[PDB]
RNA sequence: GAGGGCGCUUACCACUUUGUGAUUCAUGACUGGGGUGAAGUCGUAACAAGGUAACCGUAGGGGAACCUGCGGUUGGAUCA
RNA sequence: UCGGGCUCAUAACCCGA
RNA sequence: AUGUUU
RNA sequence: AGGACCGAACCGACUAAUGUUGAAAAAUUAGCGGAUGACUUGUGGCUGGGGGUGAAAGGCCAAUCAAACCGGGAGAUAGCU
RNA sequence: GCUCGCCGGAAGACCAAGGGUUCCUGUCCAACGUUAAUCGGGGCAGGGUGAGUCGACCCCUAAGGCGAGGCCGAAAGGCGUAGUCGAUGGGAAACAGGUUAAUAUUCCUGUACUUGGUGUUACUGCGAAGGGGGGACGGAGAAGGCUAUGUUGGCCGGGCGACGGUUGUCCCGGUUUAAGCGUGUAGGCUGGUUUUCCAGGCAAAUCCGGAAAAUCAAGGCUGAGGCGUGAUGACGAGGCACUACGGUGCUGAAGCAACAAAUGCCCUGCUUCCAGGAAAAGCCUCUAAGCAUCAGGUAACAUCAAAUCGUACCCCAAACCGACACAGGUGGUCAGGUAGAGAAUACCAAGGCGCUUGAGAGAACUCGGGUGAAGGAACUAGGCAAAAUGGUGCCGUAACUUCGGGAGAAGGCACGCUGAUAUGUAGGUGAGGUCCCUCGCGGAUGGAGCUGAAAUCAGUCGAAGAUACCAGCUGGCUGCAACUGUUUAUUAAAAACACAGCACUGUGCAAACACGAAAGUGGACGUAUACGGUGUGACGCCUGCCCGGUGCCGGAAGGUUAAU
RNA sequence: AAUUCCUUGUCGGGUAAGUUCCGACCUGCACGAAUGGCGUAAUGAUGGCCAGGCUGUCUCCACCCGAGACUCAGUGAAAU
């Protein structure tokens, strides 16, 4: 559920929260945690590598089973948690053999539901299955990319990949982006839309929200001086340049894409 | 006003102490040069 | 002495003052529309099937009447 | 622009210079 | 298209 | 609840007077802004010079920064004084 | 030595960082001290820093650093695995009193505690670089309980007053007591114990996870404080003696209660929110390799040990950073009284101080102040600076508005003292006495005593009752930016930057991008509701035409065109 | 107009008088749509203007309390 705040103070007036009741409250499941440590966008050289990174809350890591094995063993999802390290939401799951794990959290999610993965596995929202045994048209969660690897496509709140054809020993997939891309078919993948989707509607509302979220401000190129960034200068405002990156690298449609080593797998580019 | 030299011996020893000097090709070279000048205190100690 | 009067004091209370509001009348640089006028200038929207049938409401566009979409009505002509 | 024509007649339109 | 004249 | 209100500490530094061989190589004094936050601070760590860092002023990088300091090439050159 | 003044959330008192003998005692004064100097943080001598339990080493880990081999690199060397270091963070133990010219949770007295070896004696499956558990954690907020701590009375010791009064509802002072041990409360949390079964916990496990039945309702962790004990003591005004007038012995009263009360403690709790909130060891338990009369495990008691190094002094400064005994800078801890909302402020206590030139004079002028006739912004670039406002409760309060606001708008009224209601009220706290009871850190009933605002009425003094210090001036029109925020440390704080929101645009993950000749690494343990680039800059109403030029995107048919 | 040169444009308002301010005109030397346009409650140590209060800011100074300045005594500089 999304909520508007009363304007008892500018900077709250525009806030729009997304508060989910069916979320667990308080500390997570201890054993599936581990350190994290911020990086200030900085290198192993100590150099800022990616700008705008730093500050923001503490953040301990939830393991989150991406491969989805435990074939045959069923599990019952005890609860849905909040994970600070993704837009997605989290399911604490518990298998019949007495083992707990974290799983993403489909659209249907819901504590009490039953879950299972493997070649057998019934096609039901929330289950994992090599795509070879998955009706063409299904909508499917976090999709592996190499059979076995981990799943990487459609991991984000509201995302989902539609299977559009499975000729050959490969499947063609309509990613969220628009692109259509073949993949190994023996490749795992969970049933259903990834959860939440209300994400999209948050508003933040004041600079601090992003601040306490690890996003330091961005200073336009025009604001600076000729010696810092390819833009900037001119007595007042101005521009008269050819829109480029601070390293003079040209912008505004240049693609940069360059693989050849993976072209094959791309059947039709986004638009 | 708050001046530039705020003392701290941990740091002092870590930035310009004997071993830090001893820990890198050029550091050692700093020692060489000084010993060759006949300096009485290579590095600063107890 | 008692009683009264004057004086003083208290209560009510007209002027009068201070603040901030409602409200009505006159007026105001400029300015929207509306009414009336003799032959002006531009086109010709409506009237006949008015030469894109007309209108109502709504919205967008345009020197102008008006154009265009959307739905609705017939207060529409033909043997369609 | 000018002369001729179409029109009841102006314009448009057509013709000739 | 107009005629107190596109 | 609040980058909410008033207001000490603490962070700042808008005005004025003084000072300007100062008490001080940037202060004092009377006022001033913020003050649960993009808050403020101790210790320790990382980034190194055409490079870092910058809510961007060419601001900051050990009292100096349109390219630091130290040594070296070096007795650079100087149709100038 | 007697007075006078100054700070008292410091100008006191402790700690760290830093200094590094400034500490204490003699002695000296050239130089150092902005003067003198007999005095000093000066000179010279001599003295002084006592630990099982305070700190450090040590155990453990963070960010980060190093790093056998290894991967890269013309060389130098860059990176990194096993590891190994690294505190600002986790890990066992002591309190009060006394003492020295100077040390003391270190010496001394008193009274405790920790963990290991040995020994003896009873009882017993012990055992890992390993599993689980624990350690282990955010923000804000709301009380309840409690202590530190204070007031008053009671108590005790002393006093009966330089000038009217003062044997009393009078005056002064003190009224202190730790760890540890016992109890295990206010209160917080969680249902227990049993047996059996298993595709998990890199192997096993009697552990943790999961599944079944069984069977009990009270059980188990947690926990400030109070009380008892420590205390037969210590401390304690003051006595009485000696004094080399510094002090040294010996001695010692009272030592309670009620009330108030933190920002500390119960509380790493509780309620709740989103930004979702270290690691590892010690520790508890679980097995394995194994040892199986052993050894080890438990407990009581006895004994031995607990090294080493730091320990003076300064500390919001004359001892540190500032060239100075420099109006600057500098992290943590404590928090008495009266008044007060208070860590503001004003006066004091304790404690420390009057700032290392002094003495006179009492001009202009300058500095910093106090008061001002009439006038009151005429001054001036400009009301710069002054002067003014200045508390609390209540009444009351416009346009506009994003319905919060604007508003502390504005503007008014009350404000001291005494008496009364009421020899001190509503409230608070709360003992006897009474009863009960799962019996006591119980409950119920009881309302003594102790505490104590506010209100109305009557009365009263002054020029004036928020009386000092403290302590918003208010109102109308308009530009710019929505706003909190940031910036030129040292002439600019702004209308500049940033911002939430908006758009364009790139990127399919070995991503685009970025640091790096590379290995590696950031992006991201993320994955198009994400991440980078650019412009715009809340929100409302909106964002038209132009693709010629430049830029960018797609396109090949031809013309041209490189090495070859 | 943070943009208007001509410019103290012109009219209205406020003033005893107003190169500023406010409202208007539009002839925009040389606004205008994310180089964002035009609005906008709140906010601002923000630029411009007006009013009450207040005043030594002033007409126009006066007195007074402190620190220097002046005399004595010790030390004892500087720029040039
Ligand atoms: Mg941005
Ligand atoms: Mg600039
Ligand atoms: Mg510039
Ligand atoms: Mg310009
Ligand atoms: Mg009118
Ligand atoms: Mg018509
Ligand atoms: Mg028609
Ligand atoms: Mg129609
Ligand atoms: Mg605030
Ligand atoms: Mg100040
Ligand atoms: Mg404030
Ligand atoms: Mg500098
Ligand atoms: Mg040089
Ligand atoms: Mg040369
Ligand atoms: Mg030379
Ligand atoms: Mg002398
Ligand atoms: Mg001394
Ligand atoms: Mg000495
Ligand atoms: Mg090696
Ligand atoms: Mg390395
Ligand atoms: Mg270690
Ligand atoms: Mg430490
Ligand atoms: Mg001492
Ligand atoms: Mg033994
Ligand atoms: Mg473990
Ligand atoms: Mg008490
Ligand atoms: Mg007498
Ligand atoms: Mg008494
Ligand atoms: Mg000491
Ligand atoms: Mg001095
Ligand atoms: Mg000082
Ligand atoms: Mg004070
Ligand atoms: Mg006067
Ligand atoms: Mg004048
Ligand atoms: Mg004037
Ligand atoms: Mg002023
Ligand atoms: Mg004043
Ligand atoms: Mg203006
Ligand atoms: Mg602003
Ligand atoms: Mg400046
Ligand atoms: Mg400034
Ligand atoms: Mg972005
Ligand atoms: Mg802008
Ligand atoms: Mg446009
Ligand atoms: Mg005037
Ligand atoms: Mg104007
Ligand atoms: Mg513009
Ligand atoms: Mg703008
Ligand atoms: Mg501000």
From Swiss-Prot, chain A:
Subunit structure: Part of the 50S ribosomal subunit. Forms a bridge to the 30S subunit in the 70S ribosome, contacting the 16S rRNA. Interacts weakly with S6 in one of the 3.5 A resolved structures. In pull-down experiments interacts with CedA.
N6-acetyllysine modification, residue list: 241
SMART domains listed in its UniProt record: Ribosomal_L2, Ribosomal_L2_C
Keywords of this entry: Acetylation, Ribonucleoprotein, Ribosomal protein, RNA-binding, rRNA-binding
Keyword Acetylation: yes
Region of interest (Disordered), ranges: 27-52, 220-271
UniProt-listed PROSITE patterns: RIBOSOMAL_L2
Name under which the protein is recorded: Large ribosomal subunit protein uL2
GO BP terms: cytoplasmic translation; negative regulation of DNA-templated DNA replication initiation; ribosomal large subunit assembly
Biased composition range(s): Low complexity: 38-47
A Pfam family reported for this protein in Swiss-Prot or TrEMBL: Ribosomal_L2
Organism: Escherichia coli (strain K12)
A GO cellular-component term linked to this record: DnaA-L2 complex
Curated annotation (Swiss-Prot), chain B:
Gene3D superfamilies referenced in this protein's UniProt entry, alphabetically: 1.10.287.3980
Signal peptide (from-to): none
Pfam families membership: Ribosomal_L34
PROSITE patterns: RIBOSOMAL_L34 (PS00784)
Family per record: Belongs to the bacterial ribosomal protein bL34 family.
HAMAP family: Ribosomal_bL34
Listed name of the protein: Large ribosomal subunit protein bL34
The species this protein was found in: Escherichia coli (strain K12)
